[PDB]
């Protein structure tokens, strides 16, 4: 077993909790924490800003070196970097930002990256400041990810709505 606790099971492989992913990561120290990244790995706000702050900006320093070497990610893409003090690894995943004119169909591709990892602690991709409907996103997650995913949803009101209206 592992050190996750307090999660509501949604399917064979998807679990969910009303929690801050940053606090969940510090407590569990999972193998993989997912960051809700942008293509530039500029971790300004939301999950990305909060994770980076918890690493004392080390995530940003590492990310800037990654971009200087490799260039930007693709929308729907990902890269594996250090988890710093929060996890062994951080999987930086770019969901489409609907406010940036990006294809919502790329959300499925974004979640497909989770399948390369047996277990992950993750946020809902493209939710929050990325502008997509979190209910939709949960549906895409459940219908796309086959590995074991532990979702942290920080917003209590949304968690209650997602968990109660989940099909
Ligand atoms: O709860 C949700 C639902 C989707 C996403 C979101 C994206 C864009 C705008 C609002 C919300 N989100 N944020 C977080 N999820 C987990 N841990 C977190 N920690 C901190 Cl800080 C924030 C945070």
Curated annotation (Swiss-Prot):
Annotated control of activity: Inhibited in vitro by GRL-0617.
Topology relative to the membrane: Multi-pass membrane protein
Domain Macro: 1-167
Catalytic activity: Thiol-dependent hydrolysis of ester, thioester, amide, peptide and isopeptide bonds formed by the C-terminal Gly of ubiquitin (a 76-residue protein attached to proteins as an intracellular targeting signal)
Subcellular localization: Host endoplasmic reticulum membrane
Function: Responsible for the cleavages located at the N-terminus of the replicase polyprotein. Participates together with nsp4 in the assembly of virally-induced cytoplasmic double-membrane vesicles necessary for viral replication. Antagonizes innate immune induction of type I interferon by blocking the phosphorylation, dimerization and subsequent nuclear translocation of host IRF3. Also prevents host NF-kappa-B signaling. In addition, PL-PRO possesses a deubiquitinating/deISGylating activity and processes both 'Lys-48'- and 'Lys-63'-linked polyubiquitin chains from cellular substrates.
Protein name: Papain-like protease nsp3
Lineage summary: Viruses, Riboviria, Orthornavirae, Pisuviricota, Pisoniviricetes
Parent-protein start and end of this portion: 1025 to 1191 of 7096
């Amino acid at each position: 077993v592992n050190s996750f606790s307090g999660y509501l099971k949604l399917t064979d492989n998807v679990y969910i909790k009303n929690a801050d992913i940053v606090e969940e990561a510090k407590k569990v120290k999972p193998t993989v924490v997912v960051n809700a990244a942008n293509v530039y790995l500029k971790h300004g706000g939301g999950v990305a800003g909060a994770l980076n702050k918890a690493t004392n900006n080390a995530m940003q320093v590492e990310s800037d070196d990654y971009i200087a070497t490799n260039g930007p990610l693709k929308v729907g893409g990902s890269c594996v970097l250090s988890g710093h003090n929060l996890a062994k690894h951080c999987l930086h995943v770019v969901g489409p930002n609907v406010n940036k004119g990006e294809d919502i169909q790329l959300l499925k591709s974004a979640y497909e990256n989770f399948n390369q990892h047996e277990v992950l602690l993750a946020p809902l991709l493209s939710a929050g400041i990325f502008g997509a409907d979190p209910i939709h996103s949960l549906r895409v997650c459940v219908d796309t990810v086959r590995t074991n995913v532990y979702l942290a949803v920080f917003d209590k009101n949304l968690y209650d709505k997602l968990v109660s209206s989940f099909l």
